[PDB]
Amino acid sequence: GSSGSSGSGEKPYECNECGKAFIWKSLLIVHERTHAGVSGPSSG
Ligand SMILES: [Zn+2]
């Protein structure tokens, strides 16, 4: 059972890459980009 009862998600927009949230569309656009080869292979 998940007795959490918490977690935001009342935004009309929500990134698809990560799943972030933004009350405005633009905010989501200028964000989605962040998922464009911003960093290299930080694992292995
Ligand atoms: Zn994102």
Curated annotation (Swiss-Prot):
Notes concerning its domains: The KRAB domain functions to reinforce the nuclear localization of isoform 1 in addition to its transcription repression activity.
Residues that span the membrane, as ranges: none
Protein name (database record): Zinc finger protein 268
Induction: Down-regulated during erythroid differentiation by GATA1. Down-regulated by HTLV-1 Tax through the CREB/ATF pathway. Up-regulated by the regulator of nonsense transcript UPF1. Up-regulated by the cyclic AMP-dependent transcription factor ATF4.
Function: Involved in the regulation of antiviral interferon signaling. During viral infection, recruits SETD4 to TBK1, leading to TBK1 monomethylation, which is critical for the assembly of TBK1 complex and IRF3 signaling.
Start and end residues, zinc fingers (C2H2-type): 13-35
Similarity remark: Belongs to the krueppel C2H2-type zinc-finger protein family.
Annotated signal peptide: none
Organism, scientific name: Homo sapiens (Human)
Source superkingdom: Eukaryota
Tissue: Overexpressed in ovarian cancer tissues compared to normal ovarian tissues. Isoform 1 and isoform 2 are expressed in squamous epithelium tissues. Isoform 2 is overexpressed in squamous cervical cancer (at protein level). Expressed in blood cells. Isoform 1 is expressed in pancreas, lung, skeletal muscle, heart, placenta, liver, kidney and brain. Isoform 2 expressed in chronic lymphocytic leukemia (CLL) and several tumor cell lines. Isoform 3 is expressed in several tumor cells. Isoform 5 is expressed in fetal liver and several tumor cells.
